[PDB]
Amino acid sequence: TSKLLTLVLVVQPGRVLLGMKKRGFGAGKWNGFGGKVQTGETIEQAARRELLEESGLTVDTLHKIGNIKFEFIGETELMDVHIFRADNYEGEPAESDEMRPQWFDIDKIPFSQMWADDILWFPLMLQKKRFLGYFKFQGHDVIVEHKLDEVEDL
Numbered sequence: 001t002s003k004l005l006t007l008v009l010v011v012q013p014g015r016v017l018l019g020m021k022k023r024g025f026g027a028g029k030w031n032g033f034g035g036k037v038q039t040g041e042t043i044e045q046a047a048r049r050e051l052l053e054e055s056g057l058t059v060d061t062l063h064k065i066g067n068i069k070f071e072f073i074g075e076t077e078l079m080d081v082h083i084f085r086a087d088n089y090e091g092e093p094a095e096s097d098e099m100r101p102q103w104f105d106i107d108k109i110p111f112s113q114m115w116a117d118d119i120l121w122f123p124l125m126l127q128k129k130r131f132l133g134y135f136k137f138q139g140h141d142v143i144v145e146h147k148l149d150e151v152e153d154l
């Protein structure tokens with residue numbers, strides 16, 4: 001089994017918008033915006049909705065930039081995460097019950113308080129190189145195996 005999940009990174013020249021998750025799974029980490037994809041909708045439809053609800057932003061075009069499956073040792077279910085880049089948006093970022101948004105300069109991204117994988121795939125996302133990966137975790141904080149390829153090489 002895989003759980004279908006969406007993640008959106010809103011980017012401007014030199015900076016990325018992240019949100020501090022205030023509750024639930026991954027509470028206390030900065031991340032992009034997203035969540036579960038419901039049965040009967042597309043991955044993209046979920047992403048647009050969840051961005052608006054969590055950050056206040058409406059996006060025109062979402063660019064598909066990555067797909068990573070995550071496995072946790074000792075656990076059955078995988079997370080299938082679909083990652084998008086937004087280069088333009090309407091509205092202004094604002095705190096919601098789920099997320100507190102904040103801009104970070106690209107040389108100041110707080111990787112030590114993000115999911116452990118972000119530091120490894122962020123450079124591909126920032127360079128607009130579409131990618132595919134597979135990560136195996138030992139608990140929430142330790143990466144046992146990480147694999148990443150640009151899809152151009154497959």
Ligand SMILES: Nc1nc(NC2CC2)cc(-c2cccc(Cl)c2Cl)n1
Nearest residue numbers: 005006007025026034035070115118
């Ligand atoms: N950056 C990043 N890294 C992740 N790494 C996997 C160890 C969990 C998972 C997620 C993610 C994406 C969408 C929704 C949810 Cl709930 C999550 Cl947790 N994001």
